[PDB]
């Protein structure tokens, strides 16, 4: 198992989130915690054809769409730590107003708010 | 009132030959629908300014993968392709929906890729 | 049982939209063709509380965002048939734009103009 | 910009509330968000006048249900009651919708409604 | 009237408190749609026995599960334990959910269930 | 290495299907038939403490909701090849009525019908 890849991605990107799904890593499926990290960070992140922002944003996209709130919530610390502006955050959501339609840009955003307004 | 082509040379000039294939819905309805594209797709929404037209055609592409929007999907993987985005990179994106709307979803829009990197091969 | 309380229902707004896909079915899966028979037009079409060309208009709104493209167009004939005029029927695919996005709009009208233009 | 108060026009007496709360986010997202709506939405789309906007109404909650989004829906039942739509009326579209979308979307948009109903 | 206690029946029997649920938003409204519940979803369609009782409650879950249902899924889930399914069972499911609907998927399902398995 | 298991499965329940390996060749998306056979099949569907049977059953009942029709179909054969009846293929359908609407459910059954009729 190389799954000590995805995790050498997680720990300085979005750790305290991972951390957090092990706690979900106990009565249940500890080996879906186990899953998310050897082949969705360690297989198809640890590839690059794209930067690690720009994986961030496409992520959220997609979780606006599919209306994924905590998902979507623990996304949006991972950009900001992988290097994107509350601007750039947003300005993908507002986008998908067009694809996804309205409500689904309403609630991405106000999703991306708590975050957003929790440093403090 | 104007501005539509505040949106329009930005369309005229990645996609040209789509919202032309659009407007040829001119008739069985309201050109009212392609005008609102130009209008106010391209119009408030792509010429905003944070993120590259690059970077916007490769959104585009993720959020039609997961609503396997198929056609509008083949359309901005043209759209995407003439705005700078390579191989490798559209098909990135779809590999990485695999994860996050599913296998169906990213192999169902991959083929759909396949066929528009098909112009004159043959 | 009063199955007829469906069928003498569907057999006036889509006579084929119906006719066939009593075919394309029911020769090999028949409780779903009698459910949609008995359950749908027989319980809740049958109910009256809006308006005929109101329920059908709403169906296809449905429809819109679910990308059903085939069970929409059979759903189109039968908004005509009920009687909405092709102006209604394109009005709730642009709202639909809105709430749904633009790519389920934009498919919707374009699976319209078919059955719009069935005959030469 | 006869179409920002146009679309604010329908606004400001038919979905009073909740618009107001978008300056309930017109600090994180550009006013932006909460512009498009009154300009696109209500100024473009809703404007249009060959549907009634009691139509209208019942049309966003069919979509709304759909989609599953509890917050749109909500506030788009509270427009729906203040243009004219009885409670019965409301209820129904979402009957109508265990049929095309399924029971687990109808059922949680009357629940949700029932809340805009009990005493809000 | 015939169905209608059918479908009533197989709830009090195996899922009496999603039974009482219904009885508190049969208010607001729908003895209509509390009706088709009762009338349709259960004794007509789930009442069929071409599949087995455990795994016509599987599949239960595993669309509810890509519907992102998180209210009925908890419901489901309790009337999936009370039909024989174990937990190592349901848990499967929502697992194997993640490959065709998405990793968001099942990790919302599988959190969903953690909190009724915590009677 | 784990995908000798995924194709374990694959080449013996549905592999007229998944040699759709030959269609992502072209670099397009190689990558991804690989992680079907790894992932899909050498993680999830071996740890089987559910029946082959059931697993397949219940892509179904997914794919119904998602309307993956070009999917739908290469799983009713994968079902079929695994000892599943017809009508106990299209019975997981007739349920997703009440589930996923009527729309959705017609259009699981026709597209069954079709692989059912090769």
């Known amino acids: 198992?190389?799954?000590?890849?995805?995790?050498?991605?997680?720990?300085?990107?979005?750790?305290?989130?991972?951390?957090?799904?092990?706690?979900?890593?106990?009565?249940?499926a500890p080996d879906?915690?186990?899953?998310?990290?050897?082949?969705?960070?360690?297989?198809?992140?640890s590839r690059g054809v794209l930067d690690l922002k720009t994986r961030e944003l496409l992520t959220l996209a997609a979780?606006?769409?599919?209306?994924?709130?905590?998902?979507?919530?623990?996304?949006?610390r991972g950009a900001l730590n992988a290097g994107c502006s509350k601007d750039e955050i947003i300005e993908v959501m507002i986008q998908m107003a067009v694809y996804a339609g309205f409500p689904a840009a309403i609630n991405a955003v106000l999703a991306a708010?708590?975050?957003?307004?929790?440093?403090?």
């Open 1 to 28: 198992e190389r799954y000590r890849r995805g995790m050498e991605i997680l720990n300085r990107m979005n750790r305290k989130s991972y951390t957090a799904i092990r706690d979900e890593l106990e009565d249940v």
């Open 32 to 45: 879906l915690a186990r899953f998310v990290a050897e082949f969705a960070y360690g297989d198809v992140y």
């Open 63 to 76: 979780l606006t769409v599919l209306r994924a709130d905590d998902q979507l919530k623990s996304h949006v």
């Open 113 to 120: 708010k708590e975050v957003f307004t929790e440093n403090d």
